[PDB]
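re: the backbone from monday

yeah here it is again, tokenized this time
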């Protein structure tokens, strides 16, 4: 299986998360391409991937704002080759804000209108993902099983 993992992380929580999902994947026999959104490009980004996992933190406080590095890609999802593509989304937040992990919400929806297949619902980590370590391992686990 060929997986793509793209992430936008500010204080590196979602990045740690991405790393955990990657190693879970890799340990299962998947080929894993892990990329910081800082550096990526949308034009056919997803082409040649059997699985695309999108990760992003939630900022904003009183409105939803996507992790900084992430926005540009988000603006361009219609150009990644998403349709028919099998995808899952993940991100860090804090349940204390009005819009808990609203960036996961946003991304999936856009994916969905694009014609992508959400094979599993989004992992919405509240707090330090080093403290949800298991959750992480388990969601990685169910995404494989739903492909
Ligand atoms: C000023 C600020 C605003 C935040 N706003 C939101 C928010 O609107 N929704 C939410 O789920 N979490 C929110 N959070 C918290 C985070 O997303 C949390 O810090 C996450 O662990 C950061 O991830 P990262 O390092 O990958 O970028 C905010 C954090 C700060 C400091």
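seq for it, each position gets an aa:
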């Amino acid at each position: 299986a060929k997986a793509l993992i793209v992430y936008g992380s500010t204080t590196g929580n979602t990045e740690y998360t991405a790393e955990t999902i990657a190693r879970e994947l890799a340990d299962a026999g998947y080929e894993v391409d892990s990329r910081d959104a800082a550096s990526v490009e949308a034009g056919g980004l997803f082409e040649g991937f059997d699985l695309v996992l999108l990760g992003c933190s939630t900022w904003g406080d009183d409105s939803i704002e996507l992790q900084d590095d992430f926005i540009p890609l988000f603006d361009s999802l219609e150009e990644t080759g998403a349709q028919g593509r099998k995808v899952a989304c993940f991100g860090c937040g804090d349940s204390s804000y009005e819009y808990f992990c609203g960036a996961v919400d946003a991304i999936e929806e856009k994916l969905k209108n694009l014609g992508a297949e959400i094979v599993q619902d989004g992992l919405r980590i509240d707090g330090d993902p080093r403290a949800a370590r298991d959750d992480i391992v388990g969601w990685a686990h169910d995404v494989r099983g739903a492909i």
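The longest strand covers residues 86-93. The helical segments are 13-28, 71-76, 102-114, 133-144.
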